[PDB]
Curated annotation (Swiss-Prot), chain D:
It comes from Rattus norvegicus (Rat). NMDA is probably regulated by C-terminal phosphorylation of an isoform of NR1 by PKC. Its phosphorylated state is influenced by the formation of the NMDAR-PPP2CB complex and the NMDAR channel activity. The chain holds residues 650 to 841 of 938 of the full protein. This is Glutamate receptor ionotropic, NMDA 1. Detected throughout the brain, in brain cortex, cerebellum, thalamus and olfactory bulb. It is found in: Cell membrane; Postsynaptic cell membrane; Synaptic cell membrane; Postsynaptic density membrane. Belongs to the glutamate-gated ion channel (TC 1.A.10.1) family. NR1/GRIN1 subfamily. Residues 1-163 are extracellular. Heterotetramer; the NMDAR subunits are modular and harbor tiered domains that function in concert to regulate opening and closing of the cation-selective ion channel pore. Forms heterotetrameric channels composed of two GluN1/zeta subunits (GRIN1), and two identical GluN2/epsilon subunits (GRIN2A, GRIN2B, GRIN2C or GRIN2D) or GluN3 subunits (GRIN3A or GRIN3B) (in vitro). Can also form heterotetrameric channels that contain at least two GluN1 subunits and at least two different GluN2 subunits (or a combination of one GluN2 and one GluN3 subunits) (in vitro). Glycine binds at S39, D83. A hydrophobic region that gives rise to the prediction of a transmembrane span does not cross the membrane, but is part of a discontinuously helical region that dips into the membrane and is probably part of the pore and of the selectivity filter. The extracellular N-terminal domain (ATD) is a site of allosteric regulation to modulate overall receptor function.
UniProtKB/Swiss-Prot annotation, chain E:
The extracellular N-terminal domain (ATD/NTD) endows NMDARs with a unique capacity for allosteric modulation, harboring several binding sites for small molecule ligands that act as subunit-specific allosteric modulators of ion channel activity. Expressed in the hippocampus including the dentate gyrus (at protein level). Detected in adult olfactory bulb, brain cortex, hippocampus, striatum, thalamus, superior colliculus, with much lower levels in inferior colliculus, midbrain and cerebellum. Belongs to the glutamate-gated ion channel (TC 1.A.10.1) family. NR2B/GRIN2B subfamily. It comes from Rattus norvegicus. Component of N-methyl-D-aspartate (NMDA) receptors (NMDARs) that function as heterotetrameric, ligand-gated cation channels with high calcium permeability and voltage-dependent block by Mg(2+). Participates in synaptic plasticity for learning and memory formation by contributing to the long-term depression (LTD) of hippocampus membrane currents. Channel activation requires binding of the neurotransmitter L-glutamate to the GluN2 subunit, glycine or D-serine binding to the GluN1 subunit, plus membrane depolarization to eliminate channel inhibition by Mg(2+). The chain holds residues 644 to 693 of 1482 of the full protein. This is Glutamate receptor ionotropic, NMDA 2B. L-glutamate binds at S47, T48. It is found in: Cell membrane; Postsynaptic cell membrane; Late endosome; Lysosome. Heterotetramer. Forms heterotetrameric channels composed of two GluN1/zeta subunits (GRIN1), and two identical GluN2/epsilon subunits (GRIN2A, GRIN2B, GRIN2C or GRIN2D) or GluN3 subunits (GRIN3A or GRIN3B) (in vitro). Can also form heterotetrameric channels that contain at least two GluN1 subunits and at least two different GluN2 subunits (or a combination of one GluN2 and one GluN3 subunits) (in vitro). In vivo, the subunit composition may depend on the expression levels of the different subunits. Found in a complex with GRIN1, GRIN3A and PPP2CB. Found in a complex with GRIN1 and GRIN3B.
Length: 127, 144, 285, 192, 50
């Protein structure tokens, strides 16, 4: 799952959720420590954890921007994993005569023909 | 680069980023706006790649010169001379083989014909060949 | 390999989406509070409606004036189409191919003073070369830098470039193209399409005042005009990897690749600071 | 489905160059030609394998390069074949012109007149002298590579609001319901 | 996320059209058994018609 987002990003978001929860608790102190962090960390996962509402417009905007960043991150990651898996095409469909691998002796890709056959003199015409 | 002049026969003495004045020459250019219109030679301000190239040549080997633009404004090749029975040159080398102008300075290719007629020096500037289109404004087409 | 623009997340949608979401939010909040007036909501309306158009991550006290539930549901329909279009278009923008703006030319501002950049860009070549003669005759500082980063061969600079011990190589065009053509990884390119200093070709040496010169020049020019150089050049003096690059997929995406959002993150705290003042000076009302 | 729809809608068309399918035949729709009676004309007269496109040329030829790029600016003559340097100069100046694929006919421009003149040797002397002092790079930085709007950022097209303008008027429908359901509110008490 | 990605990837298939296996294709001999019947024809007086 980690292919889109780096462990540094994981730590970044896991610390930012706690930081914004601490700020939300501090805002709610001025006219809710465990319930606020629970709600914020459920919002990180778009879960129905935490049913309280903001007690000031400042907590309102704070949780607002927190949820905004949460969903923008989840959208960014779903898109990133989409692009990752769809752009991973298998290899390699040999074109034929016009194969780049054909234009040179491929030490890795093993291909040859039946020794001393019609194709042999066919290639002896085109050296 | 050709621009019309004032009654003094001169024009704005432009400069560059570091203040160096762009070299100006006076070129006697025929008024080739339309075929049939007054096409007569008027003083004009000339400046560009060939202009400063020939001034550099004049600075190096110390010649005297004149500059003017051609009347028809066309390269010239082996073409029929007014549906006659003769295929001859026109344009720059058309009048150069006739002795009108002495030396040519212009970015002309070197094909086989004009090379057979006249030899050429080293190519002062390399070049290739490309198609040009006015791209396209990025637009996603879909209904709703 | 290329990278991702930090501010590419706002590339799909201009400020039009910002102004539209704000104006629709205000108009539907006015309509909802007017509907509720027929049967407290003027403050929670913004939270409820943005939660509707954005994500159902926070529970909201939505049930008020049950007839407006149709309006808030089509609001949620706007949500479920807008988020889809965003996650689609941005993903499309993320399928960019590796660009690498390379170096504009020898006279690139970065080239003359690489020490102003961290790390300083390192270039060098083998000494006793005509290229070094020209650089010594024209550019003393870059000549001294080349001396600081002298080489001793052709392939050693190639492997230094492969392993990152050298940033660039300076040399003629033909042999560099030959080296890059048969590379298995195609991890080396020259740029300029011939934009080089001291534009020179391969002039065949001729005994002085030899009569053959003119006619043989006309013959090789006839060859030049016969349009056969392309396939012979492809066969002899090039390689297979001269067609084009490929659309590489990004590696593990780092924060900086989306650093723009991080910038907005900072702005968030800035905003909260302002509201903190609103908490400290709220004694007027 | 909408993701696949918008991402798979690539713009057209990036001309490859000599190997363009459109080049292999006289494109009645796509208008492209060259300057009539020029070096490229005899270049194509050597290879009359392009002869078909050759008699597509006069039908849309131009008598000067200046009017050719002027046509390129507007609908007619969408494409013009010409030397790389002028065309990239105009591309840098206008910031809305693009070069092709790979370049071909890697030629040179120099200077030559009648054979009665050993000046051309001094011309070669001057070009090598400027090779020993960097003077063509001065000409380049004055005229050719004078910075001048290095265009980039070829985005794979974006999405705008007017393209979705339709969905927007859907909410207007609900606005209409703002004047209908609120009488049905009174009807809720009328029926009983 | 993985579902909406992988399925979208599967949806980028190109037009296949299994065509006709050959002249002796079972569908070809009795097209009337299929709705609509597959219609084929050519100009008469031909060696193919012979
Ligand atoms: C052009 O540049 C060089 C000018 O001297 C010439 O010889 C090279 O000289 C340097 C400096 O003396 C040598 O570097 C050191 O090499 C080892 C270090 O382990 C010492 O034993 C040497 O004494 C010397 O200090 C280079 O090794 C030497 N290069 C060679 C190939 O011998 C270059 O040869 C000249 N290059 C060309 C292409 O002609
Ligand atoms: C091979 O097949 C045909 C065998 O007769 C031959 O002539 C074609 O005959 C049919 C049947 O008589 C004509 O069909 C009808 O055409 C119009 C209908 O409007 C009537 O005036 C005719 O009388 C006739 O009933 C075809 O028109 C007729 N074809 C031609 C070209 O005249 C075909 O010509 C033969 N085909 C070849 C390729 O040799
Ligand atoms: C062009 O051809 C040669 C090339 O420079 C010139 O010959 C020179 O003549 C000058 C005196 O005029 C001598 O000092 C040089 O030694 C000669 N150099 C060479 C390499 O021949 C010739 O003069 C030039 N033509 C003109 C008109 O200047
Ligand atoms: C337009 C023009 O130049 N027409 C002339 C014509 O008058 C002359 O008789 C002919 C002689 O070959 O050459 C041509
Ligand atoms: C080039 O040098 C000659 C020889 O002294 C000199 O007479 C002349 O003035 C210079 N250039 C010209 C032709 O004016
Ligand atoms: C992409 O190139 C970078 C250097 O620009 C290199 O470090 C990295 O390993 C490359 N990625 C792959 C998958 O080869």
């Amino acid at each position: 799952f980690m292919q889109p987002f780096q462990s540094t990003l994981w730590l970044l978001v896991g610390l930012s959720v706690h930081v914004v929860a601490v700020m939300l608790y501090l805002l709610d102190r001025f006219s809710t420590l465990s319930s606020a962090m629970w709600f914020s960390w459920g919002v990180l996962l778009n879960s129905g954890i935490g049913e309280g509402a903001p007690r000031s417009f400042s907590a309102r905007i704070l949780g607002m921007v927190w949820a905004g960043f949460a969903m923008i991150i989840v959208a960014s990651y779903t898109a990133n994993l989409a692009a990752f898996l769809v752009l991973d095409r298998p290899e390699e469909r040999i074109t034929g005569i016009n194969d780049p691998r054909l234009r040179n002796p491929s030490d890795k890709f093993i291909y040859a023909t039946v020794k001393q056959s019609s194709v042999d003199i066919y290639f002896r015409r085109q050296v | 680069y050709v621009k019309p002049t004032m009654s003094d026969g001169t024009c704005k003495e432009e400069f560059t980023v570091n203040g160096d004045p762009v070299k100006k020459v006076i070129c006697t250019g025929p008024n080739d706006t339309s075929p049939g219109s007054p096409r007569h030679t008027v003083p004009q301000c000339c400046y560009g790649f060939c202009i400063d190239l020939l001034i550099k040549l004049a600075r190096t080997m110390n010649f005297t010169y004149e500059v003017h633009l051609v009347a028809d404004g066309k390269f010239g090749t082996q073409e029929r001379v007014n549906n006659s029975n003769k295929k001859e040159w026109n344009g720059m080398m058309g009048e150069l083989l006739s002795g009108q102008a002495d030396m040519i300075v212009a970015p002309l290719t070197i094909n086989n014909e004009r090379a057979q007629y006249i030899e050429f020096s080293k190519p002062f500037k390399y070049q290739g060949l490309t198609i040009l289109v006015k791209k396209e404004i990025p637009r996603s087409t879909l209904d709703s | 390999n290329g990278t991702v623009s930090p501010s590419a997340f706002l590339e799909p949608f201009s400020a039009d989406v910002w102004v539209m979401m704000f104006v629709m939010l205000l108009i539907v909040s006015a309509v909802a509070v007017f509907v509720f007036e027929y049967f407290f909501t003027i403050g929670k309306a913004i939270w409820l409606l943005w939660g509707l158009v954005f994500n159902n991550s926070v529970p909201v006290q939505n049930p008020k004036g049950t007839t407006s539930k149709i309006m808030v549901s089509v609001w949620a329909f706007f949500a479920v189409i807008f988020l889809a279009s965003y996650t689609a278009n941005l993903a499309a923008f993320m399928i960019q191919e590796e660009y690498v703006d390379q170096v504009s030319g020898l006279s690139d501002k970065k080239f003359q003073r690489p020490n102003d950049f961290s790390p300083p860009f390192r270039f060098g070549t083998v000494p006793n070369g005509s290229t070094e003669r020209n650089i010594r005759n024209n550019y003393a500082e870059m000549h001294a830098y080349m001396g600081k980063f002298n080489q001793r061969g052709v392939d050693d600079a190639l492997l230094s470039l492969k392993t990152g011990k050298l940033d660039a190589f300076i040399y003629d065009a033909a042999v560099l193209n030959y080296m890059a053509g048969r590379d298995e990884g195609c991890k080396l390119v020259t740029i300029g399409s011939g934009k080089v200093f001291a534009s020179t070709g391969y002039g065949i040496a001729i005994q002085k005042d030899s009569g053959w010169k003119r006619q043989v020049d006309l013959a090789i020019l006839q060859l030049f005009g016969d349009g056969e150089m392309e396939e012979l050049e492809a066969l002899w003096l090039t390689g297979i990897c001269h067609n084009e690059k490929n659309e590489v997929m990004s590696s593990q995406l780092d924060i900086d690749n989306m650093a723009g959002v991080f910038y907005m993150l900072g702005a968030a705290m800035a905003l909260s600071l302002i509201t903190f003042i609103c908490e400290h000076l709220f004694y007027w009302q | 489905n909408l993701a696949a729809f918008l991402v798979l809608d690539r713009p057209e068309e990036r001309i490859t160059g000599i190997n363009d399918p459109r080049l292999r035949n006289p494109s009645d729709k796509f208008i492209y030609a060259t300057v009539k009676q020029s070096s490229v004309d005899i270049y194509f007269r050597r290879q009359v394998e392009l002869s078909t496109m050759y008699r597509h040329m006069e039908k849309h030829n131009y008598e000067s390069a200046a009017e050719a790029i002027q046509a390129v600016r507007d609908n007619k003559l969408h494409a013009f074949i010409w030397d790389s340097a002028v065309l990239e100069f105009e591309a840098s100046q206008k910031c809305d012109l693009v070069t092709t694929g790979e370049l071909f006919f890697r030629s040179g421009f120099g200077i030559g007149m009648r054979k009665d003149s050993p000046w051309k040797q001094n011309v070669s002397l001057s070009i090598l002298k400027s090779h020993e002092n960097g003077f063509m790079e001065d000409l380049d930085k004055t005229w050719v590579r004078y910075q001048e709007c290095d265009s980039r950022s070829n985005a794979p097209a974006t999405l705008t609001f007017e393209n979705m303008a339709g969905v927007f008027m859907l909410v207007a429908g609900g606005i209409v319901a703002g004047i209908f359901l609120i009488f049905i509110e009174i009807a809720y008490k009328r029926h009983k």
